[PDB]
Amino acid sequence: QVQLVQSGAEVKKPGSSVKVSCKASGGTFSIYAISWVRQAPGQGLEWMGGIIPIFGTANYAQQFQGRVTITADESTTTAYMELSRLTSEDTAVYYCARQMTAYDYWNPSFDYWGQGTLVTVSSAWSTKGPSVFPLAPSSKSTSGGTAALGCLVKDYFPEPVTVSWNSGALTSGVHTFPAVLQSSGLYSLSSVVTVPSSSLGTQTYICNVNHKPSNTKVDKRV
Amino acid sequence: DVLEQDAQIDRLINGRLTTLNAFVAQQLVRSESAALSAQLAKDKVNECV
Amino acid sequence: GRGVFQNCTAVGVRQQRFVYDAYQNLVGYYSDDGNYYCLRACVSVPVSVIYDKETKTHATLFGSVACEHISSTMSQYSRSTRSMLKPVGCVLGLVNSSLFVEDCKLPLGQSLCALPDTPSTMRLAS
Amino acid sequence: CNGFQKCEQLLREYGQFCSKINQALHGANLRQDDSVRNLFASVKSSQSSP
Amino acid sequence: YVDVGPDSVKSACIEVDIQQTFFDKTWPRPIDVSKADGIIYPQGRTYSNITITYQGLFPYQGDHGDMYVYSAGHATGTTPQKLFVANYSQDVKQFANGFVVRIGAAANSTGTVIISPSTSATIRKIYPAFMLGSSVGNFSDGKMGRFFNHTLVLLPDGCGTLLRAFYCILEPRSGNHCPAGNSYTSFATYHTPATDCSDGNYNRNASLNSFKEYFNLRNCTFMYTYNITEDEILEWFGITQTAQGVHLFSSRYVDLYGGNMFQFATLPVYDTIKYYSIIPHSIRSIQSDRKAWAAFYVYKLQPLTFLLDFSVDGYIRRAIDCGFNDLSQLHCSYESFDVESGVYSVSSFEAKPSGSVVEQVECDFSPLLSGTPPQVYNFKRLVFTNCNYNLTKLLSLFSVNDFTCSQISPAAIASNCYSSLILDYFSYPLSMKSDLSVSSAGP
Amino acid sequence: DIVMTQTPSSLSASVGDRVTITCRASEDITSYLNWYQLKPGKAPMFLIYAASSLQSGVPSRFSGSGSGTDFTLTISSLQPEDFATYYCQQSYSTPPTFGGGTKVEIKRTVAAPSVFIFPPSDEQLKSGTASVVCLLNNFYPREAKVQWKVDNALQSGNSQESVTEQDSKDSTYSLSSTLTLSKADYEKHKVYACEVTHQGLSSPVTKSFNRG
Amino acid sequence: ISQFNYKQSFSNPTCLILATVPHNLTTITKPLKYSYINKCSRLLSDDRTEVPQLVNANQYSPCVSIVPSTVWEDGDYYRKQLSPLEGGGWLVASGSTVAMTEQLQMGFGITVQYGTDTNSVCPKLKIASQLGNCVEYSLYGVS
């Protein structure tokens, strides 16, 4: 059995080289061919390069030629991908997929795929503590019996982030919204909870946001 | 210029060649004289010394 | 012209910036405008090929002293064999041939210096 | 010849003359060595009191 | 200027792939004078038994050179159709004069085909293709390797049993995968085994087929065809760009076994070619029939003095590069391959310049270009001292009808450093321009 | 280079329903097509190699059919695992091109969307950026159109759409739309409304909140 | 013309023949004007100084390629930007035009190779054969 372990997702500034590492456990690392393929939204999956460790020769796509260097180390059983002159178009999730056939790079079928590593470009952007915006309870906010209020995480950089309600006591009616890129370039996500208005009066609904890069935990009333 | 330089270098190297031809000839004459002197020295050591 | 300057005593009238010594070669006095600095001529090391036909071994030799300053494959020296070059006790030169010279060895051999004698088996007899 | 490479190419045409002069000097130096060896050999071979 | 085959027609260039990492694996091939590899061989006269030193264009000893290897096609299992080429087209290099090529250095040897490293095919005889041109410029795509100047193209035909030399300028093709066309990976040559190399059949049209897709050749002033024996063993091929024209040297004709090179053919080109460009050649084949071929090695030619040993057979089996070694310099001087044991003085080392020191207001030429100029007999002299002068601007300011410099280089006057500058100005007639001289019989 | 196009970008079928996916090829691919199943948060899984032979460890319901330009992937019974992206890639040429992708949606339940509008809190007003959140909940059709009218004027670009992942219990989607206005622009406006038209919804519903 | 166009190689024997054929060369076409390169120069990228390049003996100058086979006008200047491989900067070629003469005049420079041994150029003409084992080798090129 071959187990493919991708590197933890990383963010690299434009014009800075990024290294993505995929580790193969078990099987024969040298005979198998590992090909790097990336998924970009609106572009689909595109093959970038394919390398066989024993040969040490890496095929490269003509568009990516001269921008991508792929190295495989037999001792660590790890395949490394290097990309340079990063751009917003370049940002994508990279998957290490090993061809079932040991050779024959030209005809490629991948039995095993890596979990994938996502790389993003930061221009003049640095990690900072997030600003949490609660939703004020109001007649407009209340719909019939239930009034829905949520805390919007904003101005946070790196990591998906963890948001919990009542210190994780409330796991019911919580809605998780994907982080989006603002003009500032700081991710913003929404965590609205659908709860009865009477319940809001009886229980104080605090919202807790934990930022892993800045190691800051913020609790505030919503 | 290349044409002027070729003539100047050719004259200098030819002139230097004559001087070493004279130098080797004088060295050969001196070496032959030294060889005769060395034979005289052997005789002086063999008889007087 | 190639020149090396070291501190020297001031000489010459100073009306002319150049001092010569009975030849077109220039003493290059006062190379620095501020202070007198005597110039030096180009400095080079001679190379002698020590070769034995039957052994087919070649050696490199230097003149007077090479142990104190010159080193093997030195960047400063442009021409050795005109392509590529070709660590021993100081003598007439820093021979590329090693083994070194024993205090007592057979006198008869290829000519070399006051004490070094060249054998065939590279070896350096005394 | 001057150190410049252009002189060295011009030297190649006259190279044989330069080689002959170098060989003649080499013969003279070897002859001087032989004469020195013969002189000292004649002084040697005599038993000497300390 | 006649063309053997029709121009644009048939189909656009097949898709091609550049795989530099697969290519250039590198097998060391130092050229050796002792085995007489690459020796030009004096075309002038001949010698038997006698050993002589001759000065001629010669490869330097110990030169590995540049290695170029041709490879098979993509070979999809269902269809052998499809092609891939190396980056040798963008590997253009400049040679001052001369070309030396070694072919089939290790023919009939175990080898792995470049397209598939795992696949192993026995090494087979192959012939190099090149398009030497004087000036190299970027393509419309921007890839380097477009020759505006006239070029001579050497292309093997019929599996290398024929060779074609044609002086035709290359012209870009609008079709996809071709130089004028956008999204074109590389420009090179393609071959088909089924028709061109069918047993008992050799196709001269194979060169035309490569032209039909890759590029259109124009202004074909000279077209030549030479038969190739293709016996099995391969020797050396030499191109020399003499003032009269390019000269083709083939080692096999004078002696197949010897490897000595003689001038088989002469091609007259007035233009002097400065850049050499290699066209990659790939033959499509099925994976089972994939073919591996010996790499061809390119060596530079430089004027050198070489001691050459001529055998009683009259073929040079041994040579000495006098420049390569101090012992070689002694061998060249004595003119004998073996010299008796001795200590010999050799050319001394020379110091390499480092730590440059420079010792150094504005001489004015305004009076010379202003006012009313004097007559020749009443000349006006201007003296410049204690000033730095730029003479290049003065030369640009006035066009010079006659320029003659005596005892000084014309280039040297602008940049030389000296005690004082002297300038003179006077009015001179064009009729008496010839009469005026530093010294003249005329009064 | 060969280009591979998937005929269905997305389809909706209940569990136990046969699914047919068609892959179109610009050039002949005799038998060189590879099918990959991608589920979010995990690596894609090989299904069919050469479009003729099922990969080992893959259920019998997945089937490989078709030759050359046209290829077909058929699942006899839909399963929760089966509801994942499908990709067809040509193996004929050295540069492989993946298919557009096929998305499968459960049809177990149909739910009309619930729309509510929430005004920004005081801290947003002090920050200088005011975001109004319009929440759409429990809508089974993935496709929906959300528009913002402020003072009877349409808003674009400033409005953004964020959607939760499928609940998978009722197969419904929850979407929140936030509209951002500068403090001067926000203060002068008195009416903020989000109008949504939904295929599941019988009649388009507009949620409007008066300023203050 | 000697400096930037045609210069005979001094080492080879040098002969210059200037001849005009009024009616014999009917096939030869009349060129519109005689054309020669007055000055050939190479410009450095800095543009501070421009250095002229003299033609090598019996050689085609790089500036010649920029010049058309017949110069368009006297004093014409041709400028091209050099490639990075060419070292950058610009190449400037200056050419002059002389009106064609009524009878075409052609200059011929002839160098006779006395180098190689494979062949020989001579005029034409048993005595000449090997019945003469007496004096005189007299062979193809060596007498």
Side-chain angles (χ1 to χ4, degrees):
Chain A
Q1 192 267 345
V2 189
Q3 172 62 225
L4 299 175
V5 184
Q6 277 273 25
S7 59
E10 62 247 346
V11 39
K12 198 69 62 181
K13 72 165 190 59
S16 180
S17 63
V18 59
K19 201 165 199 57
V20 190
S21 62
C22 176
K23 199 273 185 187
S25 312
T28 31
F29 178 68
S30 58
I31 92 168
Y32 294 145
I34 304 191
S35 304
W36 287 85
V37 39
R38 74 175 192 182
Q39 164 68 48
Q43 281 85 39
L45 282 157
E46 43 265 344
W47 164 84
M48 292 166 292
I51 185 187
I52 298 191
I54 181 183
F55 299 146
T57 61
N59 194 20
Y60 298 120
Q62 189 256 359
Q63 59 268 7
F64 295 107
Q65 267 169 13
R67 284 195 57 254
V68 55
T69 304
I70 310 184
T71 54
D73 184 23
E74 304 274 16
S75 303
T76 60
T77 70
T78 311
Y80 310 95
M81 140 158 293
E82 191 87 353
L83 202 52
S84 300
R85 68 218 77 258
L86 296 183
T87 70
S88 59
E89 317 108 28
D90 293 341
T91 71
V93 41
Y94 310 96
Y95 304 93
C96 51
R98 56 148 291 256
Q99 185 186 351
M100 47 182 302
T101 306
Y103 320 112
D104 202 4
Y105 310 75
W106 332 121
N107 302 150
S109 306
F110 318 112
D111 57 348
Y112 272 91
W113 285 66
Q115 59 251 32
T117 301
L118 206 148
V119 173
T120 324
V121 288
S122 52
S123 51
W125 300 326
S126 62
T127 280
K128 73 177 197 182
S131 57
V132 193
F133 300 126
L135 256 33
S138 69
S139 59
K140 353 274 182 183
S141 297
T142 310
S143 180
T146 163
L149 29 86
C151 53
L152 198 143
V153 191
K154 176 86 205 68
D155 295 339
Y156 87 86
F157 211 49
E159 291 282 333
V161 123
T162 57
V163 48
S164 61
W165 272 74
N166 308 349
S167 302
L170 175 73
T171 60
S172 178
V174 190
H175 295 104
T176 55
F177 291 101
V180 284
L181 267 312
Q182 266 70 32
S183 59
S184 62
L186 295 149
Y187 313 101
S188 70
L189 78 103
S190 314
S191 185
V192 295
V193 176
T194 309
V195 259
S197 57
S198 58
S199 188
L200 295 168
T202 199
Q203 162 72 21
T204 298
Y205 284 93
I206 56 173
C207 144
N208 175 217
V209 175
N210 307 334
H211 198 253
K212 306 310 172 186
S214 72
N215 292 317
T216 56
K217 327 294 179 302
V218 35
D219 299 57
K220 67 177 311 176
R221 215 284 154 177
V222 176
Chain B
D1 53 74
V2 182
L3 278 320
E4 279 180 0
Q5 162 254 142
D6 292 352
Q8 285 272 357
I9 298 200
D10 196 22
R11 284 184 265 99
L12 183 55
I13 70 185
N14 194 22
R16 283 182 289 182
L17 183 67
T18 71
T19 76
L20 49 87
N21 297 342
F23 172 80
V24 294
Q26 72 91 13
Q27 288 286 146
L28 253 297
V29 169
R30 296 201 312 176
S31 72
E32 265 75 277
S33 305
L36 298 173
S37 304
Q39 296 296 323
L40 293 173
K42 292 163 56 177
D43 299 349
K44 299 278 184 183
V45 168
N46 294 332
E47 305 168 16
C48 315
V49 174
Chain C
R2 185 176 307 264
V4 168
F5 349 107
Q6 63 275 354
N7 202 13
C8 271
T9 171
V11 310
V13 57
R14 286 281 316 275
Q15 163 78 188
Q16 289 93 356
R17 210 195 72 95
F18 295 151
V19 148
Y20 279 42
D21 50 331
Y23 281 113
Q24 282 294 327
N25 90 278
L26 25 283
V27 186
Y29 103 105
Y30 247 95
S31 66
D32 178 29
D33 297 353
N35 290 322
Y36 182 104
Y37 280 97
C38 43
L39 228 87
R40 294 196 92 105
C42 166
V43 68
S44 294
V45 284
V47 36
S48 297
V49 200
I50 318 178
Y51 172 72
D52 202 284
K53 181 170 53 184
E54 40 107 340
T55 329
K56 216 154 298 300
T57 52
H58 53 269
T60 307
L61 194 59
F62 303 108
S64 301
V65 51
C67 70
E68 187 71 29
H69 157 76
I70 117 159
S71 180
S72 60
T73 193
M74 247 304 185
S75 177
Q76 46 176 169
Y77 304 128
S78 179
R79 313 296 178 186
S80 42
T81 71
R82 292 231 56 180
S83 308
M84 11 70 65
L85 242 303
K86 171 186 172 176
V88 205
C90 211
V91 263
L92 79 156
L94 206 55
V95 209
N96 266 192
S97 158
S98 298
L99 264 303
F100 188 60
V101 44
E102 296 201 12
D103 296 355
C104 180
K105 202 56 72 181
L106 35 123
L108 189 57
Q110 183 170 136
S111 310
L112 200 42
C113 187
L115 283 174
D117 184 44
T118 327
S120 55
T121 51
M122 302 85 189
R123 248 67 179 266
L124 190 62
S126 179
Chain D
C1 184
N2 32 293
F4 292 88
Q5 204 61 224
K6 178 61 182 305
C7 172
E8 268 101 46
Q9 84 96 0
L10 297 166
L11 195 68
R12 287 164 54 179
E13 286 79 66
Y14 306 95
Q16 17 89 21
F17 298 120
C18 310
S19 302
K20 265 121 57 184
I21 261 62
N22 294 157
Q23 291 164 5
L25 212 39
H26 275 302
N29 70 50
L30 289 176
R31 271 182 271 103
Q32 296 174 32
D33 294 335
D34 300 344
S35 304
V36 161
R37 293 167 177 265
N38 300 345
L39 169 68
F40 289 114
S42 306
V43 328
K44 245 293 294 179
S45 92
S46 305
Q47 289 97 204
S48 169
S49 180
Chain E
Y1 295 101
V2 55
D3 197 2
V4 278
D7 300 348
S8 176
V9 76
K10 210 191 63 60
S11 301
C13 302
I14 312 294
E15 179 181 356
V16 272
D17 188 21
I18 307 186
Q19 298 164 21
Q20 189 56 41
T21 63
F22 288 77
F23 283 105
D24 224 8
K25 280 180 282 181
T26 76
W27 336 99
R29 303 287 175 175
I31 188 170
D32 198 4
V33 303
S34 75
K35 65 193 310 296
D37 267 5
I39 304 302
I40 257 55
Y41 169 78
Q43 200 180 352
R45 307 153 178 90
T46 216
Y47 297 83
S48 179
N49 201 203
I50 308 295
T51 292
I52 51 100
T53 170
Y54 158 82
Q55 31 188 182
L57 268 286
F58 279 122
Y60 215 93
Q61 184 184 172
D63 179 31
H64 286 267
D66 304 336
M67 322 170 186
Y68 310 96
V69 50
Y70 294 157
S71 183
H74 264 305
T76 304
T78 36
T79 47
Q81 290 292 162
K82 185 56 188 302
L83 220 262
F84 101 106
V85 288
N87 218 1
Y88 305 145
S89 55
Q90 312 189 26
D91 300 345
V92 180
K93 297 180 189 63
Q94 187 170 193
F95 70 99
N97 192 15
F99 208 33
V100 240
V101 174
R102 180 205 303 256
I103 352 173
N108 316 321
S109 304
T110 309
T112 56
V113 67
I114 317 294
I115 173 83
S116 175
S118 55
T119 305
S120 57
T122 176
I123 289 305
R124 306 156 212 272
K125 184 164 192 164
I126 207 180
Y127 276 92
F130 25 79
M131 31 149 191
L132 270 60
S134 304
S135 172
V136 56
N138 66 317
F139 268 115
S140 176
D141 288 30
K143 299 174 176 297
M144 189 260 298
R146 172 70 182 97
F147 288 75
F148 317 116
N149 287 14
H150 211 135
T151 58
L152 42 122
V153 184
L154 261 296
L155 201 54
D157 262 358
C159 272
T161 64
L162 189 72
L163 79 99
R164 301 284 317 273
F166 40 95
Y167 199 48
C168 315
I169 333 186
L170 62 138
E171 188 262 349
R173 278 179 59 99
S174 299
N176 190 19
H177 303 294
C178 317
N182 63 323
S183 305
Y184 113 96
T185 84
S186 185
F187 151 72
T189 304
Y190 84 101
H191 202 84
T192 56
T195 59
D196 313 334
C197 290
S198 40
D199 59 325
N201 308 307
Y202 296 120
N203 282 182
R204 190 181 175 182
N205 50 268
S207 56
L208 282 325
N209 297 344
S210 310
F211 132 70
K212 230 66 74 187
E213 285 191 357
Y214 287 98
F215 71 102
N216 287 344
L217 27 87
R218 294 295 179 264
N219 295 356
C220 288
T221 324
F222 309 105
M223 308 201 73
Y224 292 93
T225 170
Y226 307 99
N227 298 2
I228 301 191
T229 71
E230 258 269 348
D231 296 340
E232 189 184 11
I233 51 180
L234 204 22
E235 284 70 38
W236 287 75
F237 186 72
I239 292 287
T240 308
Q241 225 295 319
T242 71
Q244 319 103 29
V246 276
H247 290 265
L248 298 97
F249 287 69
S250 188
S251 161
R252 59 176 185 269
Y253 297 101
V254 50
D255 198 6
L256 192 70
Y257 310 107
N260 298 160
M261 228 177 312
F262 107 105
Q263 183 184 292
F264 179 63
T266 293
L267 213 154
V269 172
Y270 343 106
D271 191 18
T272 55
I273 275 69
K274 307 182 302 179
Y275 282 89
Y276 68 91
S277 46
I278 300 294
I279 7 172
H281 171 248
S282 180
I283 322 184
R284 50 181 47 92
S285 185
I286 44 183
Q287 292 186 0
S288 61
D289 291 1
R290 262 169 173 169
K291 331 239 71 184
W293 301 282
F296 73 90
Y297 316 100
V298 143
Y299 302 89
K300 199 60 66 69
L301 265 193
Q302 30 268 340
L304 277 171
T305 307
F306 262 47
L307 177 62
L308 303 161
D309 179 26
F310 288 81
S311 65
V312 54
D313 205 13
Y315 291 111
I316 37 182
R317 294 288 171 264
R318 209 171 44 176
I320 273 298
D321 183 5
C322 319
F324 187 78
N325 259 164
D326 56 351
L327 40 117
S328 293
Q329 290 280 355
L330 298 175
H331 298 150
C332 210
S333 300
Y334 287 98
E335 214 178 359
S336 63
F337 276 72
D338 60 314
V339 292
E340 25 84 22
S341 323
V343 185
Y344 305 104
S345 60
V346 87
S347 309
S348 300
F349 300 77
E350 60 177 16
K352 286 199 180 72
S354 58
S356 56
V357 169
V358 182
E359 301 287 329
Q360 271 191 12
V361 185
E362 184 56 65
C363 320
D364 199 8
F365 311 106
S366 61
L368 144 111
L369 50 96
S370 67
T372 307
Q375 306 298 339
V376 44
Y377 58 96
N378 200 14
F379 53 88
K380 272 182 179 59
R381 187 78 52 171
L382 243 55
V383 292
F384 310 111
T385 322
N386 210 8
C387 55
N388 30 32
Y389 69 104
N390 296 147
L391 226 47
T392 164
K393 53 177 178 56
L394 173 123
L395 294 175
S396 79
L397 283 174
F398 323 108
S399 62
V400 182
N401 276 187
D402 181 29
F403 200 101
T404 149
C405 258
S406 182
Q407 304 120 8
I408 194 77
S409 172
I413 68 182
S415 300
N416 61 339
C417 308
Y418 41 81
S419 174
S420 181
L421 210 174
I422 274 81
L423 175 133
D424 194 87
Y425 52 103
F426 57 80
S427 305
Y428 87 95
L430 266 198
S431 58
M432 302 210 317
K433 156 184 64 181
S434 57
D435 305 350
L436 189 58
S437 178
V438 287
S439 53
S440 79
Chain F
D1 187 25
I2 321 177
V3 43
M4 304 308 290
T5 56
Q6 222 146 342
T7 310
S9 59
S10 58
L11 85 140
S12 58
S14 294
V15 270
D17 291 10
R18 183 195 185 97
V19 165
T20 305
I21 306 171
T22 313
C23 195
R24 317 292 295 188
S26 174
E27 312 295 329
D28 179 30
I29 337 259
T30 49
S31 51
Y32 288 83
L33 196 78
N34 301 315
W35 287 97
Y36 299 107
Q37 192 176 17
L38 168 61
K39 184 86 71 175
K42 60 199 60 57
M45 304 304 180
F46 208 0
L47 305 171
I48 325 276
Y49 58 98
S52 57
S53 183
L54 185 68
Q55 175 64 230
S56 58
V58 181
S60 61
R61 49 179 186 264
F62 292 78
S63 176
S65 181
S67 183
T69 63
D70 296 352
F71 284 114
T72 33
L73 178 74
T74 295
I75 340 280
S76 69
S77 59
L78 251 184
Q79 295 291 140
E81 46 266 9
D82 298 359
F83 293 109
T85 325
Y86 291 108
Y87 292 100
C88 49
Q89 67 145 4
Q90 44 106 350
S91 174
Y92 213 90
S93 79
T94 288
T97 51
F98 287 77
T102 305
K103 306 286 189 174
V104 212
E105 158 72 0
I106 344 178
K107 300 197 306 184
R108 292 174 294 102
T109 105
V110 182
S114 304
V115 185
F116 348 89
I117 183 59
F118 322 115
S121 293
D122 62 329
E123 82 286 323
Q124 310 193 32
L125 277 345
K126 79 173 52 65
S127 77
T129 162
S131 308
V132 282
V133 182
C134 188
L135 184 58
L136 277 81
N137 275 355
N138 51 79
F139 59 93
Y140 145 78
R142 320 288 74 176
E143 38 168 359
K145 53 223 69 61
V146 178
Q147 182 58 228
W148 280 91
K149 54 155 57 69
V150 161
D151 293 20
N152 210 8
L154 288 329
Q155 273 81 36
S156 182
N158 52 353
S159 52
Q160 67 93 15
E161 314 288 332
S162 55
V163 58
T164 67
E165 74 286 332
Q166 320 191 354
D167 305 348
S168 189
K169 43 173 181 57
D170 43 9
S171 191
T172 60
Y173 250 175
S174 296
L175 176 133
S176 71
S177 190
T178 72
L179 188 69
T180 57
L181 295 95
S182 79
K183 276 306 124 299
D185 187 37
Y186 192 83
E187 256 47 62
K188 72 183 187 182
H189 289 321
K190 198 262 169 182
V191 175
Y192 319 90
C194 46
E195 64 270 30
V196 301
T197 301
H198 186 247
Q199 356 277 156
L201 191 54
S202 58
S203 176
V205 51
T206 308
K207 214 62 179 184
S208 319
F209 94 82
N210 59 278
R211 183 49 185 168
Chain G
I1 299 188
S2 302
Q3 291 178 342
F4 295 99
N5 294 119
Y6 176 71
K7 207 276 301 172
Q8 313 215 16
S9 54
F10 301 132
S11 58
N12 238 9
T14 65
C15 270
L16 186 64
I17 320 177
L18 302 86
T20 174
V21 241
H23 315 289
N24 295 7
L25 260 48
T26 311
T27 62
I28 274 229
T29 329
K30 297 198 60 179
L32 181 64
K33 44 197 53 182
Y34 298 109
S35 286
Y36 75 96
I37 294 190
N38 187 214
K39 174 220 63 178
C40 177
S41 290
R42 186 257 159 176
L43 177 59
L44 193 47
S45 58
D46 56 16
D47 201 8
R48 300 183 69 256
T49 309
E50 173 150 19
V51 271
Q53 174 252 344
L54 58 131
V55 84
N56 308 345
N58 300 338
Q59 99 132 359
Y60 232 67
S61 197
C63 57
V64 164
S65 66
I66 333 167
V67 187
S69 60
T70 303
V71 185
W72 302 320
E73 56 253 2
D74 58 327
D76 206 350
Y77 32 80
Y78 306 99
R79 287 183 290 265
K80 60 152 298 184
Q81 190 165 357
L82 296 183
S83 304
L85 245 178
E86 299 171 357
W90 283 70
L91 228 173
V92 182
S94 175
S96 301
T97 59
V98 185
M100 53 172 175
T101 54
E102 183 66 30
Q103 45 168 356
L104 292 180
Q105 300 137 356
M106 301 177 57
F108 325 113
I110 307 192
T111 57
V112 233
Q113 177 182 359
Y114 62 96
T116 191
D117 76 288
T118 55
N119 319 117
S120 174
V121 287
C122 316
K124 67 178 74 67
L125 55 90
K126 168 61 67 175
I127 58 171
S129 194
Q130 252 66 15
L131 228 278
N133 302 143
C134 304
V135 201
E136 288 146 317
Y137 309 151
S138 211
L139 275 181
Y140 293 174
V142 192
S143 297

